[PDB]
Amino acid sequence: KQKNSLFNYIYSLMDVRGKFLFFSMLFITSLSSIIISISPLILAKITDLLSGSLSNFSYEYLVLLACLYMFCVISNKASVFLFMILQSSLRINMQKKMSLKYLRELYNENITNLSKNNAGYTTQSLNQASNDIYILVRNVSQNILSPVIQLISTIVVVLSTKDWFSAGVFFLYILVFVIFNTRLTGSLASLRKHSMDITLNSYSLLSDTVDNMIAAKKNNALRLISERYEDALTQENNAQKKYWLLSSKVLLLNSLLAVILFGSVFIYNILGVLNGVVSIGHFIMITSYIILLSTPVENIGALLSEIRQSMSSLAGFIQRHAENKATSPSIPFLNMERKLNLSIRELSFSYSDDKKILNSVSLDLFTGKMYSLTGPSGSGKSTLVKIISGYYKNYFGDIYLNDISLRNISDEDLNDAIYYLTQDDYIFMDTLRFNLRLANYDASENEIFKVLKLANLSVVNNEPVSLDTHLINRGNNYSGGQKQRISLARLFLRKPAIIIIDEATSALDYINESEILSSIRTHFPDALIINISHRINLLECSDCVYVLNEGNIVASGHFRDLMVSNEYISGLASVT
Template sequence: MRKCSIKLLFKKIFNYKKELIKGNIFAILATITTVIVPLFIPLLIDELLLHKSNTLTSFVSKYIAPMTLIGYLFFFLVLAIFLRFLGVVFSTNQVRSMLLISKNISLDIRESAINHLKRAQLKEYERFSPGAITSKLVTDIDTIDNFIGVTVGKLIVSVLILLFTSIILILINLKLALFIILTNPIVIFFTAKMARKVGQLKRVQNRAVEEFQEELNDSLELFNQIKAANKEDYFFSRVLKKAKKLKDISIEFSYKSDRAMRLSIFTFLSGYELFRAVSILAVAYSDLSIGLMLAIFGYLWIMMTPTQDIINFQYSLATAKAACKRVEDIFRLSLEREVKNPKNPFNKEVEIRVTNLDFGYEKDKLILKDISLEILPKAKVAIVGPSGSGKSTLANLIAGFYEPDSGDILYNKISYKEILPKDIRQNIYLILQHPKLFNDTLLFNLTLGKNYPKEEIEKAIDLAELRRVVESLKDGLNTIVGKDGVKLSGGERQRVAIARMILSNPKVVIFDESTSALDVHTEERIFSNLKEFLSKRSVITIAHRLSTIESSEYIFVLENGKLSDRGTPKELLKKDAGYFAKMI
């Protein structure tokens, strides 16, 4: 089911009945005050100068007071200004009502998209760059917001003005009115065809914006590495290349949409000139008065803005459709499974059993093949293997970030399919080699916003060998660590991640090269500090460094996505040709 489409947008608009009714009432009042005014001066010309009728002057004389020519002019001038002021007030309130609707709908779409992202499978999420998702959540939803708040709001007023104006024109002269009314759709049909092409160009432009944001985000996020490699010119030239591409596409879009708009205006103005010529003929060959002819000219001019708004609506509709299609990409991300009557096997020590597991990021390309292993409660195991063998992928699967393509993962003999993914992640803590930190305080990066007793935080700091780091910082735990923790060294960031894990108090801990940036002595102190803490938990260690895995009781060797060997360190050392023996 689609979550973003034009049909759904209009359905959402009608959900705000109170604001919609209020907005439409203001639109009707604004229309009435707008379409009455152009009648005053033309009728006064007929009555005061040409003496053809006395409808307006008789009404004023009867219900207000008899006046001189100047008096009538002054009275209707004041009345016209007052009505125009009322029109502004009513229009402003109508726009406010539509903006309230549009802002609520755009917030609703953003909330839905963000909530969908929260529950999306990590494997699916990783198909997009942060820049691509940001573009969809900001640029595209802003396009939809503008379509609802401005374009649809104007459309309501425009249709009402055209309707009321058409009624007045029919009352003035039926034949001339029908000629004007029936030729207007030709202009709208002509512009609708051009609007579709503009919509396609808008999709291309938004994609170019996304590509530029992706390239820029990557270069800014990896700025330190780019500097270290002296590759600023190369990487930022790529950013500029995308910027130039965006410029070229934006010029093409702006030029072609403006050209289409001007052609539409030209068509309408040509019709306007034709209508004026026909009106003059009507004065010459019918009983149409000069005053009413001027009124028709006025109403033709009034019709120009709403007709233009209807033309603009078609272009905005095309761009909103394109934006909806791009936002829909987020809603197409597969979600983590929902579990009816979920079980929680983590109320005791955890045994993990992997059976015949296959997994690949792409359907036809498996990373892990037929993996079967068992990790007993409180066991200390290591997974070793060359780079690219699938060690981190297996860790992500065990920790509940990915799901197998086939096979099973059992936690205390309960399949992962019967357990909520968040429960798996809550109890199995994966510490990454390159932990990400928020541009916030060190305290926030330790607690991630959760309230812990001060004693627990202090204990975690000591166990993770962070005490000296905290004391060296000017503001201590309240120090802002910078984007991705740039103010901390790689080893310090890894210690923050370890402290985070301690506070989380998981049942199983996975170290995925989590101490690779630490010197051997600091690493030894941390594991010495954690000895009691880890003794009550299962520990899985992924590492290339022998010192990191030497305390492991059992080792699994992973090569080319398959378990090529397994055993205790002593058993594996006896096999001279094995990967573990080569590590030694």
């Protein structure tokens, strides 16, 4: 079932130019194997014409024979050069389509599955898959028809000259070969997959160490960092050496078998020539076939190995990138109301198992009102808003948005209705313009600059901020607060019903914090605002405060009614 899907996926990556280049590669490889299977006869015809006659033969016929042999050799090499030219053209062709499909496949993945591995891993995963496709494209376009043509014609012709021992031992070899190799192909594929996986693990650890280099540098941790990479590389070498040995054994055994079987056919025809039983022409033909047969034998060996091993390694890739999907019913044409109310009913959640993060959160929130959510680090404020923001769908209980459940809301509509301002910032290495166009693609130069004022990012160090400001990796080109302001500026281009601010202002000064938080309520008057904070002034300003403790909502109501009643908020209101 998955075998059919694999080849259909490779075929789909080929546009019209791609399909021609692939069939041209198959044709040229097939045509040249026809032509080169003629050449051992030409050689035999040259040999007899000369053998016996004492320079008494048609010199014009020898020239015609020698020219035909040359045509064979020239056309076969022209074919090799033409195949590799078409091969690289098809690699280039299929490359772009493959890479975009990956990015688009990664975008449609769930946050839980995305978080599982880093960039180093996903980057090298594409690498392996691309190469796996390449191998499969090659093995199909080159090692299917061509070795069959050359092996069929060889037994047909040697059978025609009524040499039974030669054609016999020849057919015996292809039989013993195809059996022996298939009986060891899977054993190689498993050893190769396990290696390639360890290789991913190693690239994963390199990107992890390089992304956190400053930390390792400042803690003078070269030894600790170096040793855990050195361990990964040692796991890589050992996995590679295990493949190497099996690969080397198969090659040595296949070589020894060829020497024993084809060596006998060579000795047999030598004795046949010495006892006048066999002609020299025929002896040269059998000699010519023994030599010619190596490349189709090689191309079969390759196909049996390469097709199975690249199909195994490519199977594993398609699995960890298209699998994780529960159901998701969604609504066909939903046009959400400008005013939305949130109703969380007996919400329960666990990230893993054994430990529950949200016990039975029951809340009811309404349009145009600001609410504060607080609790100790580990209560699950972020978790709760993440679930409201559709990060996770594996939850017990229900969440409504004006009668409509979250389960029946499309991820596109949900993201248009709600805007979550994350605890950590996500700044793209690009222009400031690009980082803001993330929020709204169709936004004009003015709409974007207007938004900079709202996020207090229109002027930095008495200088006007350019929309063409290049932003370094993780936006570390900008201050902690300036990073927060990028993410805040995004909100102003968006048009949501619910606005979640998860400690999204923590890096800002008292002036900026208040001005932006003011601009949010001004710009979005009907927006329901959930605010996560450990600070009394941010809790004070809200229409109602909710205290989360160990998964359950322990206290509700006005801040003043809570600053003495509740154990946590009294703990906050310890200062002053």
